[PDB]
Amino acid sequence: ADRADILYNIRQTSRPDVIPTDRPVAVSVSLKFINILEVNEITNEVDVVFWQRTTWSDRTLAWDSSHSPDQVSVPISSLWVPDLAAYNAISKPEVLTPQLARVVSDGEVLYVPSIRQRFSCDVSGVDTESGATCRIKIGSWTHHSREISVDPTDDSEYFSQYSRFEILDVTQKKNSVTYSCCEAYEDVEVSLNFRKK
Amino acid sequence: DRADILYNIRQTSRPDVIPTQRDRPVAVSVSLKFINILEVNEITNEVDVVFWQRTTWSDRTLAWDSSHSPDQVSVPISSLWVPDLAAYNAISKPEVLTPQLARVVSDGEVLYVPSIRQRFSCDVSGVDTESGATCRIKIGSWTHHSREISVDPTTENSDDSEYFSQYSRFEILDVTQKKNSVTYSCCPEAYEDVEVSLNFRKK
Amino acid sequence: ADRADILYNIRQTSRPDVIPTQRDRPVAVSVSLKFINILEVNEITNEVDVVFWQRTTWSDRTLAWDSSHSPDQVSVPISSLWVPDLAAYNAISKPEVLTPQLARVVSDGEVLYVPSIRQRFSCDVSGVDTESGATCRIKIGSWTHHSREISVDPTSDDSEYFSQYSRFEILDVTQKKNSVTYSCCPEAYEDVEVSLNFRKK
Amino acid sequence: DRADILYNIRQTSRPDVIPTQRDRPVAVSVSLKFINILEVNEITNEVDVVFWQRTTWSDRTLAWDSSHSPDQVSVPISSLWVPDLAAYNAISKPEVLTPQLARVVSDGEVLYVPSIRQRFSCDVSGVDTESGATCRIKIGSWTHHSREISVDPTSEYFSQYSRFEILDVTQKKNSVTYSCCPEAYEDVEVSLNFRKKGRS
Amino acid sequence: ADRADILYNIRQTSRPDVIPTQRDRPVAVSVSLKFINILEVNEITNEVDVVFWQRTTWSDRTLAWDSSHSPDQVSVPISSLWVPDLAAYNAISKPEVLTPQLARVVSDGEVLYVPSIRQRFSCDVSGVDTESGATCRIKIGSWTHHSREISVDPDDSEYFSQYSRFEILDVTQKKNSVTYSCCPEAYEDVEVSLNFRKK
């Protein structure tokens, strides 16, 4: 089996519109901040660029790689992808990078889109020594905690040295929203502690 | 399993056909949850808002026996009929910020809650006073009259503190959602709408 | 026949890319702009940004069905229909369609399409801040069908439709037919000239 | 009838294949009619213009016997091969303002006239003087060299409401070898001589 | 065989979503930027808007055809071909492709793709109004193919607009190979250093 056969077999068994679950699909999400482009302390809005490292398992994709490549890049339109959204986004995610994921032969998927997006978050203290804490909430838009679970995994490693801002700290913790409109939806709450240089 | 449910939904779903049951109007429920007010122009009477547009209706063609299978799935809206709702006083296209998936329940109930950013022409006078501005947003079927689609509010009366970001430079005083009817001189029939009154002011 | 059968039959006989001429008469298209809002006016650059309902009607007899025991009207996505290739000659932006792209088809073949459009125009903005106002002329016609294939006809002060929250008020809208020969082509192209007389409140 | 002509065009039309006949280049004619000059920045040397790009070529794969049938139809350009023309000094994507339909004549001649709004990098110096600015716009095939596509050139529709007036438009042909490739690429250079109507 | 037959056969054998590696060798992708314009420079935000032709070449032997009796090159829409998933790591906008998305395929399988791209970057704009100028570094490589699947290898002002407010002093292109914390394998990039200043 070569890469074409692996992609062909992924298309036979992949159901892009069907969650590949008695138990939730465990989605891992971790943000690497690349840039903070604009901050508005009057409107409490920030424009950021981040790599959204997203992993999950889909065992329907698995193949025997004893005599064949054990990983391929696949367009995400061929795969089920978690319907993750930033709950406090005030613009559409601008995906800056090719929309390809890596599929490993055991069914593990890795997707790392570079996203530019505007958020509503607390920008107070951005001009002080201890900085602002901007919380970004990412979770399934339409799958509750029994269908999708979300778990978090240096902070400045890929952060642009040319930003007007610097990162003091990033903490990623698991949370839960119930709204009366819609059971409980799990999210990762990413606390970006940043200040002006 | 979920694949069978999605497959069967695609066999019977007709995305371009209103799913009327015995020639009754399709009863669409619409309720806006304001999340943010981004820009307000008192000179041009224009507001830019983000809201969750909670939308429900029934399509019994979708129904399935869930006695031994999941009773709900997430389905891309391109696989479903969706009501052709428009904001009659919008001055921009609805920007949908979220994945375009609806929940289908096994009895045929559909729930769709897109997060939308949209600009409106509405009354911004009083925004910098204690009693605030009242911006009315009119949402209804663009092309289905009252005998094909009926539109009802969920919650009539609310202050939306459940949903509205306290990081906005605006605060919400009151949201009232009431049913209305427009007849235009284009057409003899009436189009039903929900009129959402957003009472808000600058902090 | 139910609504699904009507849509199915419309897709069998509808030819979206073929002008539905009957016995090589032109397709009679009716066009009427109902101004909803005037959003930006620049007296220096002579540019206006407006929102209008472009009320468009025509007949396509290929669509007709027997409605004696069935609904006599349906909403159809415009991608399933032939639609006239109308363009605003003096537009300086693409038409931004704000509304769902569905038309109503009546069982005799009459089609009604009313998109809400936001669009920028190059037109005469002089006098906008005076009592008699500006007169901004918008020219709409078929882009590629001459007068033997498409005829365009108008169907007012527009107080029914125009937002009282605009900074502008409408004094008058007049819609008049024209027929122009262009240097590319020997045939005449029909247009409606819409004269929007408006001023600052 | 028109439906049969469109049906036959869809049988033989290859939108992704240049319709060269034997070894011969497809002869593309391009001529710009300027409609508006909207924004001019003399500091950045950038202009925003609206023009009707009159484009003609032959595709004999489309040709049909019109002795008993209409000799012309409007066809969506997605059903046709269209030359891959690009403005080399454009700094924005062409905004096509008009329905994307071409006229096909029964002998295979195609006429396509999109109304385009586009921003260019060009010489705006002199715009506020009597002699005006000369903005050169360079258009040619992006991926077909001179043996596959040849390009030849050929105020009437200019808006009276522009802040600018047109003094002169000249179109000349050029043929350039670029360091990517051993073959020559043809372009038309359109020289728009224009000036501000006001004082400064 | 005519051009229609060549396109038809390319569609039979082309797998647009499958990297055309031969026997576990990386696909050798060649990338070289020709700068056309520097449009907007913000010295406060360290952001620049540039236009460049991204000259991109690789081999895909699945596309090869016998050209003894037929043209040996055609223009093909890139949606019919595998194209390397190149990304500019320090871009802060999507690439705006200004040109028709057609590549040239030679009968031996060589592909040439030269999109004209307008894109905004986060890079060092300090010194732009001085004699030695700013150095804006643009980092391009495969987003999802590591060094064993894709390798990337590299006259500056030749196509640069004389009407820009900026002039180019120097362009250097160097190869790099980076391991990122997601993944055990190395990703290749070209780092393009654009040294420019205000006229």
Ligand SMILES: C[C@@H](c1ccc(C(F)(F)F)nc1)[S@@](C)(=O)=NC#N
């Ligand atoms: C090199 C980048 C990357 C690697 C792998 C993938 C994939 F597996 F998801 F396809 N996407 C992007 S990077 C720099 O964004 N890795 C990190 N962190």
Ligand SMILES: C[C@@H](c1ccc(C(F)(F)F)nc1)[S@@](C)(=O)=NC#N
């Ligand atoms: C009337 C316009 C027109 C005519 C013909 C065509 C076509 F043949 F390309 F379809 N398009 C536009 S106009 C005025 O733009 N033609 C000229 N000049």
Ligand SMILES: C[C@@H](c1ccc(C(F)(F)F)nc1)[S@@](C)(=O)=NC#N
């Ligand atoms: C002439 C241009 C060109 C040539 C060839 C190709 C192709 F083969 F990739 F399709 N694209 C564009 S140019 C001027 O942009 N090449 C260079 N430099």
Ligand SMILES: C[C@H](c1ccc(C(F)(F)F)nc1)[S@](C)(=O)=NC#N
């Ligand atoms: C409000 C959001 C949501 C939940 C459920 C649905 C459903 F209709 F698809 F079921 N759509 C949207 S959510 C996940 O609670 N967001 C937040 N914050």
Ligand SMILES: C[C@H](c1ccc(C(F)(F)F)nc1)[S@](C)(=O)=NC#N
């Ligand atoms: C004008 C609006 C409407 C009515 C009918 C049609 C159709 F026939 F083309 F389908 N489209 C739009 S409406 C609903 O009256 N506007 C509001 N306000």
